[PDB]
Amino acid sequence: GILGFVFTL
Amino acid sequence: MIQRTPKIQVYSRHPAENGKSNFLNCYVSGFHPSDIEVDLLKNGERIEKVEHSDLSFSKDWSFYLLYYTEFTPTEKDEYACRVNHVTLSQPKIVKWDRDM
Amino acid sequence: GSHSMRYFFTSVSRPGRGEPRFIAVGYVDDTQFVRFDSDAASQRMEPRAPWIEQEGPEYWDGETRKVKAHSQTHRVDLGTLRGYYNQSEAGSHTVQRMYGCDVGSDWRFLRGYHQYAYDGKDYIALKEDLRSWTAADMAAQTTKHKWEAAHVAEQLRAYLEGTCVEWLRRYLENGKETLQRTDAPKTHMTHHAVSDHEATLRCWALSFYPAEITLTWQRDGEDQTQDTELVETRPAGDGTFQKWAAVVVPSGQEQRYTCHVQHEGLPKPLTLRWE
């Protein structure tokens, strides 16, 4: 299962 | 910007035996950027029913794809893979050699 | 033994040709098990291995929701990088990201990874300690500072050491038939005259899994590294792999050459000889 949070460069 | 030329291998999934169902593969790898055109040819003509794997890449970031189609080899039918990419001035045709 | 879970994301800008392309694929070891393609009709994370099809709708809806957030994030990133490198709106560019975890032969967390590339070059990577960043250039150092200030590494560390490996262990058990297996290479040699005084011996390894294999030729027990044509290991399209290694040999000398095959699925390394 993939990461459940995201963040931009 | 970075441009890496595709390696091309054209081959069957199983050993070619005339009259026996198989898959014809063209594996393109080591390339960048990801935009690539790949055709499978039967006696020089494009095969219509061709699928490919989902775009993925290697530890070095270069891309790889498997293009494939069901086929039944015969003694006479010739197969090839035709690839174009930003790194190629003209399409590269690689012939299927049933022992490669 | 050891196992890995890895996710690979590719985002490609398509100026004037609509939204960027976004492709996500997930692997356990050398077996792909999921995909997402921005250009596909479903707009869902999709199974690509039989064992994952048994996960329920909560899994698929969740992976779909999360992968769409990844997609949106990379859509933003493409704009950000264009800005950082002062690039034209007209060109196509590529962001890649990979992350995942390894467990050792004890199935405990061994190594975590989380890294990005822009137009095929390293951009930023989480170091092996899962606490610090490697920034490849000036632009990346901006991201690094931003992620340091937002404590991104800590949040990633918790996934890579915890949830990542928990997923991996779940998949290993659920897909035990597909994942905890080896398929030993089926091997053979071919012989083809290239002239009246030369022949190519080609050593074939077929239908093996995992992909890792070593094919070597020896002449009188001496490795012929510099004289062997070795092709890249290639997928059969059925979940197995193929590779060959060839040497061109003086006709009459076939008996001198041995091919050696090492693969996890083998009881003992194999030696093949022509004749």
mmCIF file of C-alpha atoms in Angstrom:
data_model
loop_
_atom_site.group_PDB
_atom_site.id
_atom_site.type_symbol
_atom_site.label_atom_id
_atom_site.label_comp_id
_atom_site.label_asym_id
_atom_site.label_seq_id
_atom_site.Cartn_x
_atom_site.Cartn_y
_atom_site.Cartn_z
ATOM 1 C CA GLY A 1 0.000 0.000 0.000
ATOM 2 C CA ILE A 2 1.144 3.517 -0.898
ATOM 3 C CA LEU A 3 1.887 6.546 1.312
ATOM 4 C CA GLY A 4 -1.258 8.080 2.779
ATOM 5 C CA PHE A 5 0.140 11.603 2.874
ATOM 6 C CA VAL A 6 1.589 13.763 0.126
ATOM 7 C CA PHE A 7 3.887 16.827 -0.075
ATOM 8 C CA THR A 8 5.114 19.013 -2.864
ATOM 9 C CA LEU A 9 8.709 19.684 -3.993
ATOM 10 C CA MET B 1 18.626 17.383 -21.175
ATOM 11 C CA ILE B 2 19.248 13.641 -20.621
ATOM 12 C CA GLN B 3 18.468 11.315 -23.533
ATOM 13 C CA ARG B 4 19.217 7.579 -23.382
ATOM 14 C CA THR B 5 18.640 5.274 -26.362
ATOM 15 C CA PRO B 6 16.407 2.214 -26.041
ATOM 16 C CA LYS B 7 17.915 -1.228 -26.001
ATOM 17 C CA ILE B 8 15.704 -3.495 -28.082
ATOM 18 C CA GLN B 9 15.143 -7.237 -27.819
ATOM 19 C CA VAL B 10 12.659 -9.064 -30.005
ATOM 20 C CA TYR B 11 11.773 -12.564 -28.938
ATOM 21 C CA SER B 12 9.066 -15.104 -28.256
ATOM 22 C CA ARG B 13 7.693 -15.895 -24.799
ATOM 23 C CA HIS B 14 8.146 -19.629 -25.348
ATOM 24 C CA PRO B 15 10.410 -21.456 -27.757
ATOM 25 C CA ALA B 16 9.046 -20.912 -31.280
ATOM 26 C CA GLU B 17 7.385 -24.008 -32.708
ATOM 27 C CA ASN B 18 5.552 -23.620 -35.974
ATOM 28 C CA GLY B 19 1.796 -23.932 -35.566
ATOM 29 C CA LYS B 20 1.897 -23.457 -31.785
ATOM 30 C CA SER B 21 0.418 -20.474 -29.977
ATOM 31 C CA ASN B 22 2.913 -18.061 -28.422
ATOM 32 C CA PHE B 23 3.591 -14.421 -27.717
ATOM 33 C CA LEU B 24 5.886 -12.170 -29.690
ATOM 34 C CA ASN B 25 7.668 -9.678 -27.469
ATOM 35 C CA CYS B 26 9.622 -6.541 -28.053
ATOM 36 C CA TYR B 27 11.304 -5.343 -24.891
ATOM 37 C CA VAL B 28 12.562 -1.740 -24.917
ATOM 38 C CA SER B 29 14.733 -0.651 -21.995
ATOM 39 C CA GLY B 30 17.290 1.827 -20.805
ATOM 40 C CA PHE B 31 15.648 4.784 -22.511
ATOM 41 C CA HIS B 32 14.862 8.361 -21.551
ATOM 42 C CA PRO B 33 12.572 10.325 -21.951
ATOM 43 C CA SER B 34 9.613 7.962 -21.822
ATOM 44 C CA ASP B 35 7.939 8.910 -25.123
ATOM 45 C CA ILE B 36 8.554 6.002 -27.429
ATOM 46 C CA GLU B 37 6.875 4.395 -30.428
ATOM 47 C CA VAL B 38 7.028 0.610 -30.758
ATOM 48 C CA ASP B 39 5.391 -1.501 -33.462
ATOM 49 C CA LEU B 40 5.449 -5.219 -34.042
ATOM 50 C CA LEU B 41 5.567 -6.098 -37.738
ATOM 51 C CA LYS B 42 4.494 -9.256 -39.550
ATOM 52 C CA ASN B 43 6.066 -9.450 -43.035
ATOM 53 C CA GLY B 44 6.787 -5.688 -42.848
ATOM 54 C CA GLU B 45 3.237 -4.625 -41.929
ATOM 55 C CA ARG B 46 2.132 -3.267 -38.546
ATOM 56 C CA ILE B 47 0.364 -5.722 -36.251
ATOM 57 C CA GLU B 48 -2.805 -4.111 -34.925
ATOM 58 C CA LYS B 49 -3.458 -6.100 -31.730
ATOM 59 C CA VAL B 50 -0.379 -5.068 -29.683
ATOM 60 C CA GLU B 51 -0.372 -4.469 -25.916
ATOM 61 C CA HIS B 52 2.299 -3.135 -23.616
ATOM 62 C CA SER B 53 3.269 -3.289 -19.973
ATOM 63 C CA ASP B 54 2.839 -0.360 -17.591
ATOM 64 C CA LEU B 55 5.680 2.158 -17.769
ATOM 65 C CA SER B 56 8.265 1.496 -15.118
ATOM 66 C CA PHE B 57 11.903 2.268 -14.647
ATOM 67 C CA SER B 58 15.199 0.968 -13.418
ATOM 68 C CA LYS B 59 17.366 2.056 -10.464
ATOM 69 C CA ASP B 60 19.201 4.399 -12.875
ATOM 70 C CA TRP B 61 15.820 6.021 -13.787
ATOM 71 C CA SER B 62 15.819 4.676 -17.338
ATOM 72 C CA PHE B 63 12.487 3.393 -18.591
ATOM 73 C CA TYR B 64 11.465 -0.058 -19.746
ATOM 74 C CA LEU B 65 8.376 -1.421 -21.534
ATOM 75 C CA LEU B 66 7.350 -4.801 -22.880
ATOM 76 C CA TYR B 67 5.243 -4.753 -26.074
ATOM 77 C CA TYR B 68 3.591 -8.025 -26.960
ATOM 78 C CA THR B 69 1.080 -9.843 -29.073
ATOM 79 C CA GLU B 70 -0.264 -13.384 -29.375
ATOM 80 C CA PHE B 71 1.055 -15.152 -32.451
ATOM 81 C CA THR B 72 1.534 -18.519 -34.064
ATOM 82 C CA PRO B 73 4.932 -18.811 -35.726
ATOM 83 C CA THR B 74 5.285 -20.503 -39.096
ATOM 84 C CA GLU B 75 8.311 -21.391 -41.208
ATOM 85 C CA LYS B 76 7.750 -18.426 -43.581
ATOM 86 C CA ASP B 77 6.318 -15.459 -41.641
ATOM 87 C CA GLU B 78 8.912 -12.873 -40.689
ATOM 88 C CA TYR B 79 8.617 -10.733 -37.594
ATOM 89 C CA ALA B 80 10.278 -7.531 -36.491
ATOM 90 C CA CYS B 81 10.053 -4.738 -33.947
ATOM 91 C CA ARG B 82 10.154 -1.094 -35.098
ATOM 92 C CA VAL B 83 11.099 1.541 -32.551
ATOM 93 C CA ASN B 84 11.300 5.303 -32.720
ATOM 94 C CA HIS B 85 12.558 7.581 -29.985
ATOM 95 C CA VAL B 86 14.090 11.062 -29.745
ATOM 96 C CA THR B 87 17.539 9.408 -29.742
ATOM 97 C CA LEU B 88 16.934 7.735 -33.132
ATOM 98 C CA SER B 89 17.102 9.688 -36.390
ATOM 99 C CA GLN B 90 14.924 7.123 -38.098
ATOM 100 C CA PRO B 91 12.991 4.124 -36.783
ATOM 101 C CA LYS B 92 15.163 1.189 -35.795
ATOM 102 C CA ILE B 93 13.947 -2.169 -37.080
ATOM 103 C CA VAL B 94 15.120 -5.272 -35.251
ATOM 104 C CA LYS B 95 14.248 -8.620 -36.821
ATOM 105 C CA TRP B 96 13.014 -11.586 -34.818
ATOM 106 C CA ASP B 97 15.541 -14.413 -34.948
ATOM 107 C CA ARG B 98 13.924 -17.464 -33.380
ATOM 108 C CA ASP B 99 17.161 -18.261 -31.469
ATOM 109 C CA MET B 100 17.762 -14.793 -29.910
ATOM 110 C CA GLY C 1 14.921 -14.848 1.970
ATOM 111 C CA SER C 2 14.966 -11.044 1.490
ATOM 112 C CA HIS C 3 12.041 -9.168 -0.090
ATOM 113 C CA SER C 4 11.152 -5.717 -1.329
ATOM 114 C CA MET C 5 8.117 -3.542 -2.033
ATOM 115 C CA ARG C 6 8.619 -0.627 -4.434
ATOM 116 C CA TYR C 7 6.417 1.968 -5.971
ATOM 117 C CA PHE C 8 7.413 3.857 -9.123
ATOM 118 C CA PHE C 9 5.769 7.065 -10.267
ATOM 119 C CA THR C 10 6.303 8.881 -13.542
ATOM 120 C CA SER C 11 4.774 12.265 -14.311
ATOM 121 C CA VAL C 12 5.305 13.765 -17.789
ATOM 122 C CA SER C 13 4.196 17.289 -18.777
ATOM 123 C CA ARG C 14 2.504 17.626 -22.161
ATOM 124 C CA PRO C 15 2.369 21.382 -22.955
ATOM 125 C CA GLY C 16 -0.758 22.300 -24.945
ATOM 126 C CA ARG C 17 -1.721 18.623 -24.952
ATOM 127 C CA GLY C 18 -3.666 18.742 -21.673
ATOM 128 C CA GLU C 19 -2.847 17.451 -18.189
ATOM 129 C CA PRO C 20 0.467 15.715 -17.438
ATOM 130 C CA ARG C 21 0.592 11.930 -17.827
ATOM 131 C CA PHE C 22 0.899 10.122 -14.532
ATOM 132 C CA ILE C 23 1.710 6.430 -14.220
ATOM 133 C CA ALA C 24 2.131 4.575 -10.910
ATOM 134 C CA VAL C 25 3.188 0.957 -10.651
ATOM 135 C CA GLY C 26 3.874 -1.164 -7.573
ATOM 136 C CA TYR C 27 6.065 -4.242 -7.257
ATOM 137 C CA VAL C 28 6.815 -6.864 -4.700
ATOM 138 C CA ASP C 29 10.224 -8.222 -5.612
ATOM 139 C CA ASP C 30 10.043 -8.669 -9.381
ATOM 140 C CA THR C 31 6.258 -9.075 -9.516
ATOM 141 C CA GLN C 32 4.160 -6.058 -10.486
ATOM 142 C CA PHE C 33 0.887 -6.017 -8.558
ATOM 143 C CA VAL C 34 -0.796 -2.658 -9.109
ATOM 144 C CA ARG C 35 -1.019 0.182 -11.614
ATOM 145 C CA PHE C 36 -2.606 3.578 -12.057
ATOM 146 C CA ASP C 37 -2.634 5.418 -15.369
ATOM 147 C CA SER C 38 -3.972 8.984 -15.572
ATOM 148 C CA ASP C 39 -4.997 8.366 -19.205
ATOM 149 C CA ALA C 40 -6.936 5.167 -18.516
ATOM 150 C CA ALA C 41 -10.726 5.273 -18.278
ATOM 151 C CA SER C 42 -11.211 3.707 -14.817
ATOM 152 C CA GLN C 43 -9.256 6.360 -12.905
ATOM 153 C CA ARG C 44 -8.589 3.722 -10.292
ATOM 154 C CA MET C 45 -5.716 1.771 -8.904
ATOM 155 C CA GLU C 46 -5.926 -1.598 -10.662
ATOM 156 C CA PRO C 47 -4.682 -5.097 -9.850
ATOM 157 C CA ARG C 48 -1.876 -6.542 -11.991
ATOM 158 C CA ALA C 49 -1.244 -9.767 -10.032
ATOM 159 C CA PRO C 50 -3.774 -12.442 -9.106
ATOM 160 C CA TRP C 51 -3.066 -12.450 -5.355
ATOM 161 C CA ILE C 52 -3.923 -8.752 -4.898
ATOM 162 C CA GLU C 53 -7.349 -9.193 -6.527
ATOM 163 C CA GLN C 54 -8.500 -10.721 -3.217
ATOM 164 C CA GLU C 55 -8.097 -7.381 -1.448
ATOM 165 C CA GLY C 56 -11.497 -5.836 -0.898
ATOM 166 C CA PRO C 57 -13.095 -2.578 -2.042
ATOM 167 C CA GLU C 58 -11.780 -0.748 0.997
ATOM 168 C CA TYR C 59 -8.255 -1.538 -0.264
ATOM 169 C CA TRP C 60 -8.978 -0.466 -3.862
ATOM 170 C CA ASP C 61 -10.838 2.670 -2.890
ATOM 171 C CA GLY C 62 -8.065 3.591 -0.487
ATOM 172 C CA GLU C 63 -5.243 2.975 -2.946
ATOM 173 C CA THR C 64 -7.245 4.917 -5.524
ATOM 174 C CA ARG C 65 -7.786 7.893 -3.252
ATOM 175 C CA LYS C 66 -4.100 7.964 -2.234
ATOM 176 C CA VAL C 67 -2.750 7.532 -5.784
ATOM 177 C CA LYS C 68 -4.922 10.362 -7.061
ATOM 178 C CA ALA C 69 -3.358 12.593 -4.312
ATOM 179 C CA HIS C 70 0.072 11.475 -5.538
ATOM 180 C CA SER C 71 -0.983 12.417 -9.116
ATOM 181 C CA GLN C 72 -2.179 15.879 -8.054
ATOM 182 C CA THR C 73 1.026 16.440 -6.063
ATOM 183 C CA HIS C 74 3.211 15.593 -9.075
ATOM 184 C CA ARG C 75 1.066 17.801 -11.345
ATOM 185 C CA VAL C 76 2.022 20.619 -8.969
ATOM 186 C CA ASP C 77 5.673 19.520 -8.851
ATOM 187 C CA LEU C 78 6.032 19.830 -12.638
ATOM 188 C CA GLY C 79 5.045 23.513 -12.407
ATOM 189 C CA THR C 80 7.336 24.095 -9.418
ATOM 190 C CA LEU C 81 10.404 22.579 -11.120
ATOM 191 C CA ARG C 82 9.770 24.500 -14.337
ATOM 192 C CA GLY C 83 9.992 27.589 -12.094
ATOM 193 C CA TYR C 84 13.123 26.414 -10.246
ATOM 194 C CA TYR C 85 15.050 25.769 -13.481
ATOM 195 C CA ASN C 86 13.602 28.780 -15.327
ATOM 196 C CA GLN C 87 12.272 26.586 -18.103
ATOM 197 C CA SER C 88 9.870 27.347 -20.904
ATOM 198 C CA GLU C 89 6.193 26.397 -20.674
ATOM 199 C CA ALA C 90 6.612 24.752 -24.071
ATOM 200 C CA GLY C 91 8.849 21.771 -23.272
ATOM 201 C CA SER C 92 7.895 18.353 -21.924
ATOM 202 C CA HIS C 93 9.572 17.375 -18.687
ATOM 203 C CA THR C 94 9.567 14.269 -16.509
ATOM 204 C CA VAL C 95 9.356 13.800 -12.739
ATOM 205 C CA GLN C 96 10.048 10.317 -11.383
ATOM 206 C CA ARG C 97 9.705 9.117 -7.845
ATOM 207 C CA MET C 98 10.442 5.759 -6.256
ATOM 208 C CA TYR C 99 9.962 4.621 -2.724
ATOM 209 C CA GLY C 100 9.665 1.433 -0.744
ATOM 210 C CA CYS C 101 11.235 -0.923 1.710
ATOM 211 C CA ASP C 102 13.355 -4.022 1.937
ATOM 212 C CA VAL C 103 13.045 -6.678 4.622
ATOM 213 C CA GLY C 104 15.801 -9.179 5.288
ATOM 214 C CA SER C 105 15.551 -12.968 5.398
ATOM 215 C CA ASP C 106 14.052 -12.502 8.902
ATOM 216 C CA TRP C 107 11.246 -10.371 7.337
ATOM 217 C CA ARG C 108 12.239 -7.403 9.524
ATOM 218 C CA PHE C 109 12.761 -3.938 8.103
ATOM 219 C CA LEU C 110 16.200 -3.702 6.460
ATOM 220 C CA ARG C 111 16.277 -0.612 4.238
ATOM 221 C CA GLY C 112 13.948 2.177 3.127
ATOM 222 C CA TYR C 113 14.094 4.348 0.016
ATOM 223 C CA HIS C 114 12.478 7.535 -1.174
ATOM 224 C CA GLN C 115 13.903 9.449 -4.085
ATOM 225 C CA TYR C 116 13.068 11.713 -7.020
ATOM 226 C CA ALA C 117 14.558 12.485 -10.420
ATOM 227 C CA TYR C 118 13.869 15.357 -12.755
ATOM 228 C CA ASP C 119 14.428 14.831 -16.469
ATOM 229 C CA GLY C 120 16.328 11.628 -15.741
ATOM 230 C CA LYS C 121 18.833 13.034 -13.188
ATOM 231 C CA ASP C 122 18.802 12.602 -9.394
ATOM 232 C CA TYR C 123 16.944 15.465 -7.789
ATOM 233 C CA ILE C 124 16.508 14.605 -4.125
ATOM 234 C CA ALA C 125 16.887 11.385 -2.100
ATOM 235 C CA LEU C 126 16.201 10.350 1.461
ATOM 236 C CA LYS C 127 19.418 8.980 2.874
ATOM 237 C CA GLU C 128 19.724 5.468 4.291
ATOM 238 C CA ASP C 129 19.309 6.823 7.857
ATOM 239 C CA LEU C 130 15.816 8.039 6.900
ATOM 240 C CA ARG C 131 16.532 11.367 8.659
ATOM 241 C CA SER C 132 18.526 13.375 6.120
ATOM 242 C CA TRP C 133 18.390 14.388 2.457
ATOM 243 C CA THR C 134 20.743 14.365 -0.507
ATOM 244 C CA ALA C 135 20.028 17.324 -2.798
ATOM 245 C CA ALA C 136 21.590 16.960 -6.244
ATOM 246 C CA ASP C 137 21.689 20.650 -7.202
ATOM 247 C CA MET C 138 20.719 24.225 -6.189
ATOM 248 C CA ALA C 139 17.052 23.751 -7.036
ATOM 249 C CA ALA C 140 16.881 20.539 -4.962
ATOM 250 C CA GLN C 141 18.442 22.291 -1.988
ATOM 251 C CA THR C 142 15.267 24.508 -1.914
ATOM 252 C CA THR C 143 13.100 21.396 -1.657
ATOM 253 C CA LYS C 144 15.479 19.947 0.934
ATOM 254 C CA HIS C 145 15.153 23.006 3.162
ATOM 255 C CA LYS C 146 11.371 22.978 2.762
ATOM 256 C CA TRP C 147 11.138 19.319 3.638
ATOM 257 C CA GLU C 148 13.505 19.740 6.583
ATOM 258 C CA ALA C 149 11.322 22.564 7.941
ATOM 259 C CA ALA C 150 8.154 20.508 7.470
ATOM 260 C CA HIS C 151 9.733 17.342 9.008
ATOM 261 C CA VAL C 152 8.907 15.217 5.972
ATOM 262 C CA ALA C 153 11.701 12.683 6.696
ATOM 263 C CA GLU C 154 10.172 11.800 10.099
ATOM 264 C CA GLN C 155 6.797 11.086 8.479
ATOM 265 C CA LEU C 156 8.423 9.038 5.708
ATOM 266 C CA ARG C 157 10.585 7.136 8.222
ATOM 267 C CA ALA C 158 7.426 6.026 10.057
ATOM 268 C CA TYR C 159 5.930 4.641 6.848
ATOM 269 C CA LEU C 160 9.121 3.039 5.582
ATOM 270 C CA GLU C 161 9.966 1.288 8.868
ATOM 271 C CA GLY C 162 6.401 0.527 9.848
ATOM 272 C CA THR C 163 3.519 0.559 7.473
ATOM 273 C CA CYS C 164 5.592 -0.229 4.331
ATOM 274 C CA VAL C 165 6.992 -3.445 5.828
ATOM 275 C CA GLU C 166 3.584 -4.380 7.277
ATOM 276 C CA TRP C 167 2.102 -4.212 3.752
ATOM 277 C CA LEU C 168 5.015 -6.196 2.386
ATOM 278 C CA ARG C 169 4.537 -8.965 4.936
ATOM 279 C CA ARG C 170 0.798 -9.050 4.247
ATOM 280 C CA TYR C 171 1.370 -9.353 0.498
ATOM 281 C CA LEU C 172 4.048 -12.046 0.993
ATOM 282 C CA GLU C 173 1.616 -14.130 2.963
ATOM 283 C CA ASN C 174 -1.451 -13.510 0.745
ATOM 284 C CA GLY C 175 0.484 -13.992 -2.465
ATOM 285 C CA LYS C 176 2.675 -16.767 -1.043
ATOM 286 C CA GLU C 177 2.064 -18.918 -4.178
ATOM 287 C CA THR C 178 3.319 -16.106 -6.462
ATOM 288 C CA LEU C 179 5.854 -14.347 -4.237
ATOM 289 C CA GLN C 180 7.586 -16.869 -1.975
ATOM 290 C CA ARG C 181 8.407 -19.047 -4.961
ATOM 291 C CA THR C 182 11.412 -19.552 -7.151
ATOM 292 C CA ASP C 183 11.182 -20.785 -10.734
ATOM 293 C CA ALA C 184 14.491 -22.402 -11.678
ATOM 294 C CA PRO C 185 15.857 -21.525 -15.054
ATOM 295 C CA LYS C 186 15.271 -24.019 -17.838
ATOM 296 C CA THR C 187 18.653 -24.085 -19.567
ATOM 297 C CA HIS C 188 20.041 -25.041 -22.953
ATOM 298 C CA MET C 189 22.823 -24.328 -25.355
ATOM 299 C CA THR C 190 22.653 -23.530 -29.017
ATOM 300 C CA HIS C 191 25.417 -23.813 -31.586
ATOM 301 C CA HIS C 192 25.594 -21.830 -34.811
ATOM 302 C CA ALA C 193 28.472 -21.646 -37.283
ATOM 303 C CA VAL C 194 29.433 -18.034 -38.014
ATOM 304 C CA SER C 195 32.033 -19.198 -40.552
ATOM 305 C CA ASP C 196 33.950 -22.378 -41.414
ATOM 306 C CA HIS C 197 36.289 -21.866 -38.442
ATOM 307 C CA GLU C 198 33.944 -20.235 -35.883
ATOM 308 C CA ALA C 199 30.757 -20.994 -34.013
ATOM 309 C CA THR C 200 28.635 -19.100 -31.516
ATOM 310 C CA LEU C 201 27.733 -21.081 -28.373
ATOM 311 C CA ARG C 202 24.727 -19.417 -26.703
ATOM 312 C CA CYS C 203 23.779 -20.381 -23.121
ATOM 313 C CA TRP C 204 20.064 -19.829 -22.404
ATOM 314 C CA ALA C 205 18.242 -19.409 -19.058
ATOM 315 C CA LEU C 206 14.428 -19.420 -19.472
ATOM 316 C CA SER C 207 11.286 -19.215 -17.358
ATOM 317 C CA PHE C 208 13.074 -18.180 -14.137
ATOM 318 C CA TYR C 209 12.001 -16.142 -11.143
ATOM 319 C CA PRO C 210 13.230 -13.902 -9.487
ATOM 320 C CA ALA C 211 15.067 -11.920 -12.193
ATOM 321 C CA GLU C 212 18.470 -12.079 -10.467
ATOM 322 C CA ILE C 213 20.717 -14.564 -12.310
ATOM 323 C CA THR C 214 24.383 -14.990 -13.201
ATOM 324 C CA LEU C 215 25.359 -16.510 -16.554
ATOM 325 C CA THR C 216 29.093 -16.868 -17.123
ATOM 326 C CA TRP C 217 31.218 -18.617 -19.724
ATOM 327 C CA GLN C 218 34.554 -20.224 -18.925
ATOM 328 C CA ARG C 219 37.292 -21.501 -21.188
ATOM 329 C CA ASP C 220 39.324 -24.159 -19.346
ATOM 330 C CA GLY C 221 37.709 -22.956 -16.096
ATOM 331 C CA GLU C 222 38.795 -19.363 -16.821
ATOM 332 C CA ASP C 223 36.001 -16.743 -16.953
ATOM 333 C CA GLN C 224 35.567 -15.195 -20.408
ATOM 334 C CA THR C 225 34.136 -11.887 -19.145
ATOM 335 C CA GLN C 226 35.560 -9.670 -21.899
ATOM 336 C CA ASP C 227 34.475 -12.060 -24.697
ATOM 337 C CA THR C 228 30.926 -12.863 -23.622
ATOM 338 C CA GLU C 229 27.925 -11.134 -25.167
ATOM 339 C CA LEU C 230 25.419 -10.907 -22.316
ATOM 340 C CA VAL C 231 21.897 -9.549 -22.978
ATOM 341 C CA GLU C 232 19.875 -7.702 -20.425
ATOM 342 C CA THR C 233 17.582 -10.000 -18.420
ATOM 343 C CA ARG C 234 14.188 -9.657 -20.071
ATOM 344 C CA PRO C 235 10.597 -10.432 -19.091
ATOM 345 C CA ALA C 236 8.814 -13.342 -20.739
ATOM 346 C CA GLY C 237 5.455 -11.605 -20.221
ATOM 347 C CA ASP C 238 4.179 -14.396 -17.953
ATOM 348 C CA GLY C 239 5.956 -13.371 -14.762
ATOM 349 C CA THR C 240 9.212 -15.140 -15.550
ATOM 350 C CA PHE C 241 12.478 -13.915 -16.985
ATOM 351 C CA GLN C 242 14.959 -14.915 -19.677
ATOM 352 C CA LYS C 243 18.628 -14.230 -20.340
ATOM 353 C CA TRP C 244 21.364 -15.559 -22.579
ATOM 354 C CA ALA C 245 25.142 -15.328 -22.774
ATOM 355 C CA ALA C 246 27.136 -16.151 -25.893
ATOM 356 C CA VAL C 247 30.737 -16.676 -26.868
ATOM 357 C CA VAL C 248 32.123 -17.038 -30.377
ATOM 358 C CA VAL C 249 34.390 -20.077 -30.332
ATOM 359 C CA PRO C 250 36.922 -21.503 -32.780
ATOM 360 C CA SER C 251 35.289 -24.494 -34.424
ATOM 361 C CA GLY C 252 36.747 -27.624 -32.821
ATOM 362 C CA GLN C 253 37.165 -25.976 -29.410
ATOM 363 C CA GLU C 254 33.564 -26.320 -28.143
ATOM 364 C CA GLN C 255 34.672 -28.842 -25.513
ATOM 365 C CA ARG C 256 36.784 -26.186 -23.797
ATOM 366 C CA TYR C 257 33.862 -23.964 -22.961
ATOM 367 C CA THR C 258 31.490 -24.267 -20.028
ATOM 368 C CA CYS C 259 28.509 -22.128 -19.177
ATOM 369 C CA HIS C 260 27.749 -21.599 -15.520
ATOM 370 C CA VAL C 261 24.331 -20.672 -14.237
ATOM 371 C CA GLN C 262 23.646 -19.376 -10.757
ATOM 372 C CA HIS C 263 20.094 -18.787 -9.661
ATOM 373 C CA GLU C 264 18.236 -18.909 -6.352
ATOM 374 C CA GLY C 265 15.871 -21.603 -7.761
ATOM 375 C CA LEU C 266 18.725 -23.998 -8.439
ATOM 376 C CA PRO C 267 19.679 -26.816 -6.016
ATOM 377 C CA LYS C 268 23.292 -26.326 -7.150
ATOM 378 C CA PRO C 269 24.823 -23.992 -9.729
ATOM 379 C CA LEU C 270 24.606 -25.588 -13.179
ATOM 380 C CA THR C 271 27.429 -26.259 -15.582
ATOM 381 C CA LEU C 272 26.542 -26.763 -19.222
ATOM 382 C CA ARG C 273 28.971 -27.983 -21.849
ATOM 383 C CA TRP C 274 28.421 -28.374 -25.553
ATOM 384 C CA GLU C 275 28.397 -31.963 -26.962
#
